[PDB]
Every structure is written in C-alpha cells, then in structure tokens.
Design a protein around this ligand. Structure first.
Ligand SMILES: [K+]
Ligand SMILES: [K+]
Ligand SMILES: [K+]
Ligand SMILES: [K+]
Ligand code: NA
Ligand code: NA
Ligand code: NA
Ligand code: NA
Ligand code: NA
Ligand SMILES: [Zn+2]
Ligand SMILES: [Zn+2]
Ligand SMILES: [Zn+2]
Lengths: 294, 294
C-alpha cells in the first residue's frame, strides 16, 4: 500500500511544430459560471454541457504557450499570477519545470489584457521576464492602460481589470520594454499576429509556423468548447463586440478547417491544442494525438 | 533565448474517482501499421484516419493504470518493458515520477497477456513488483502459458507472444505470486474483474468504483479510436475471436453510454480516459476534461 500522493503532473505539454518547439504551460484551472455568461438560453448551455459530460460551474483550464523558434524564446500569454484566485498562477512554475528560466524568454505576446493573460507578467513588483519585450496590440493597450477608462469603469470595484492590466504592463512600459503593434503584423521570424478583435478591442491571434506546419494561437477567441464549436456564433457577456467575435471565430475556424492545421486556445482543456473539421452546423474540435518528444 | 529542451513531461496523469486516486501510467508509444491490421479494406481505414487528421503508421499510446484505494495500491496492466522495442518500457519510470515505488504495489491485474501488458512485470531477470500478487483470468493463463500452444503456432516470432507471456509471468508463478480467478470476481474492495473474452481467451475488464463514480478499464477492447468508435464492428488480426471482440466492445460502449461513467483503454491517446455517448451509427469518445488535483 501507499499514501495517496494527490498531485497532478507538472503542467506543461511538449509538441514539435516543424523546427519549432511548443510547450503549453498550464496556469491551473478555475471553476466558471458558464450558464450565466453565454448569450443563449440557460437550458441550452445546460444541455450542451451535459452532452460533453460537463457540470454546472465548468472547471476551466487557463493556458499560455511557449514557442522556442531556436533563435528566439517567446511566450504567448502569461497566466494570472495572483490576480484571479488561489487556483491559478502556476505558469511560472510550469515554465521552469518545462526546463526554461524566466530570464531566457525574449518576448511576450499578449492575445489580450485580461487578468488571466497578463497577471503572470509580474512576480510581485518585479518584472517576471526581465530580459524580454512585451508586445500587444495598440488598440488593446489604448483601452486598458487608459486612466480615463478606469475612472470611467461601469460595474465599479470590479474595474480591477483596468487596475489589473495596469499593474501588469506599466512596469514594462516604464522600463521601455513595451512595443505595441498595429493589427496584422510580422513579429519574430516564424510568428505573426493577426487581428482577431471582438473579445476585446485589440484581441490578437498569434499564428506560429515552421516548415509548413502551422499553429494558430487563438487566445480567448473561443471560451466554451461544449457550445462554441458546434455553434460558432454564440457569444458571451464577456465579449466587447459580439458580432465581431462571431465573425472572427467563424473565420478562424473556417480557415483552420480548410487548411487542416492546428489551433489552441487559452481555455480549451489543457494542453488545448487540436485540429478542427467541419461538422454539419459548425465544427468538430480534434485534440492532438498524444506524441512523445525525445 | 535558449536551446530547445525537447523532452515530454513525465508520463503520468492524476484523476480522482470517489475516494480513490487513479494515475494513468504511460509506457511510451509505438507506431502501428493500422491500415494493415484492421479487417476492412485499406482505403477505408486510411479514409477514417484522415477524417481524424491522422495517418498510418500511427503513433499509438500504451498505458497502464494505477489505482490507490487507500488500503490498497493496484496496477492494472504494466506496459511492455523491452519486449516491444525502445519506444516503450517507461511505465516503471513514470510510476516513480508519479511518486510511488514499485515495491509499494500490492496487486497487479492483467486484462490479457500480450507483451505490451505483461512485459513490465519483469525488470531484467528480476520481479519488477517484488511485493505484488499478480492476477489474470485462468483461461488467459491456460492459453498463453501452455508449452503446447507455443508448439502449435508455426508463425515464427508469434511464438514470441507465447514466450513473452511465459517469460513475463512464470517468475511470479514460481514465487507463488500468481493467483488467477475465473470469470467475474470481486478483487480488493472497489474493484471487480468482469469477463470480456474475445480479444484473447481470457481478456478481462476491471471495473473500479468508489462513491458511485465508476471507471471501466477495458484493456484492448479497442485499438484504433479513429475507426472503431464510429464502427464498433471492425476487428483486427490480433483478435483471437473476431465475433467476440466485436460483441464485447459494443456491450462495453453501449453500457458506458447508458451509464454515463468513465472508461479507459490501453491504446486510446494518453491518458486514454473519457466518457462515451452514442452518435448516429455508433459512438463518440469524449476524453476527460483536464482537472487539477491537490
Ligand atoms: K530564475
Ligand atoms: K488593432
Ligand atoms: K521583436
Ligand atoms: K470510499
Ligand atoms: Na521587439
Ligand atoms: Na514557412
Ligand atoms: Na525501488
Ligand atoms: Na460483488
Ligand atoms: Na470465454
Ligand atoms: Zn478574456
Ligand atoms: Zn482568458
Ligand atoms: Zn495492447
């Protein structure tokens, strides 16, 4: 016999993409009230959930993706650190267990500035990635880092999002390490930002490609696998432009389905990487087959 | 920047079931000439794999399952040790990565005696699990351990399967550590052996259950997910009784669909755990949702 260990495996998943090395890094999981946030009848998501063997508050993974192009070490999204509950902020640890040091990261690309994507930028009041530049969309930054917008926040108190994006990015801004880009942009060789606005004013997709092998890093372009693959147009109360999100999601899915390449998203079951094919009304997400990397 | 690490994470997946702890143990992966194995025209198989973004030779998982019942630590299947080439035999290492020691395993349940399941019983010339009692269906033992049956398989190195089983289980028989059962039989509390003969004469399913949460360990009841879930009728050349495997697979699938409980299988993409639901003609496998245990 033995005492139960009750600990999950290190939160990182290795995958080769052409000549690049991808490592999904889990920040952990948090239970979310799916029913209340979806723009569709409560009974409808409760049914979608049940068909996916999902329960009331969905335990959702929060993920970031490390890309090592063999020339640059780039991290896509950084998790929440301590901005979104006691159950997140595991990225830094997983990055190290993944075999890397925060100091080795050259660049950080932000899909959007929500707490669960920018919190990891800071370890206390010190840059968590001291030797990297932070890249995000200009519209994204002009929205969250806006003093005006903060003091102009609706459901006040819960405007810690503005405070949140600020404490996470300003330190790099003042260190002269924030380099915003505008929409579709060539970044480091092998990676490109594609403007997939809607979830937020400057939400960005990061397309990774090596040797004809592509991986579109979707950010929060999709939030609930149980309903948004089958019905791509269903949005949430968390999206800025519902119709923009819908249009961009359908474009992303159509394209990846047409091209047969990989996609990943911050909240699909960790590692959250897979292919996507057409299926009647919408799409069928196909998780990557398990594969050993030596 | 930094050199690419290129190593997969430890191959162990934690999951709680009632008061039990389940740890899927990856023994590695092996490529399988799947289109040659399935008993249907090659083009058909190849088309099914494609719809799932796959191609043969197909990287296929080989998994074993550790169950800590609190009072007992049992291992269901053990991987191949060396019997199948250098890409396997990692179950031992992964068990330790999982925070357990081979010497702590109390019992070992074998779904069947193919090499990729009993190989890990031995480490070199030594018992890998020195303090464990091994269990299997007597029909399985009578068949694989029969010097006669070996001397009746003209198929040069098919006798290997017979030798594999023998070399793998006789050290335990010789030590009085082998205890067969016949047909359905309650093993330690929380775990039942249910006959599922077909793949091999005594192929057995192990059902674990705690606090109403059920997990059926199906062994090799399914080999190619991209084919056999949509078509439970397709068999393979390694199946002893074709009709029987089909029947037992359908019974398992129909049962997990109506019960809505979890099922696990040695060759479903690591960790190979999920639920099953009927979809038109046949079934659809829904892999467990990533979950953090603390
Ligand atoms: K360090
Ligand atoms: K923009
Ligand atoms: K750059
Ligand atoms: K119990
Ligand atoms: Na730059
Ligand atoms: Na290219
Ligand atoms: Na030991
Ligand atoms: Na019983
Ligand atoms: Na029988
Ligand atoms: Zn978001
Ligand atoms: Zn998010
Ligand atoms: Zn097998």
């Amino acid at each position: 016999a033995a005492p139960q260990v009750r600990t999950s495996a290190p939160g990182y998943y290795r995958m080769l993409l052409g000549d690049f090395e991808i490592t999904a890094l889990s920040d952990g999981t948090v239970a979310l009230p799916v029913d209340k946030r979806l723009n569709q009848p409560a009974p409808k998501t409760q049914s979608a959930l049940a068909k996916s063997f999902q329960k009331a508050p969905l335990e959702t993974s929060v993920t970031g993706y490390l890309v090592n192009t063999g020339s640059k070490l780039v991290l896509v999204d950084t998790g929440a650190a301590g901005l979104f509950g006691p159950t997140l902020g595991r990225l830094a640890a997983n990055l190290k267990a993944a075999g890397y040091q925060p100091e080795q990261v050259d660049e950080i690309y932000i899909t959007h500035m929500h707490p669960d994507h920018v919190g990891g930028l800071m370890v206390g009041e010190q840059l968590a990635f001291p030797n990297a530049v932070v890249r995000a969309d200009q519209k994204e930054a002009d929205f969250w880092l806006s003093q005006t917008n903060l003091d102009k926040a609706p459901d006040d108190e819960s405007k810690g999002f503005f405070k949140g994006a600020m404490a996470s990015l300003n330190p790099y801004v003042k260190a002269g390490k924030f380099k915003p880009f505008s929409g579709n942009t060539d970044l480091v060789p092998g990676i490109k930002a594609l403007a997939s606005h809607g979830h937020t004013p400057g939400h960005t997709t990061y397309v990774v490609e090596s040797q004809g092998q592509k991986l579109a890093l979707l950010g929060d372009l999709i939030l609930v696998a149980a309903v948004q693959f089958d019905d791509p147009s269903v949005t949430t109360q968390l999206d800025s432009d519902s119709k923009s999100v819908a249009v961009e999601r359908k474009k992303a899915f159509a394209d990846a389905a047409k091209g047969g390449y990989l996609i990943a998203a911050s909240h699909l079951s960790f590692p959250g990487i897979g292919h996507i094919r057409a299926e009647g009304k919408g799409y069928r997400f196909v998780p990557v087959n398990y594969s050993v990397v030596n």
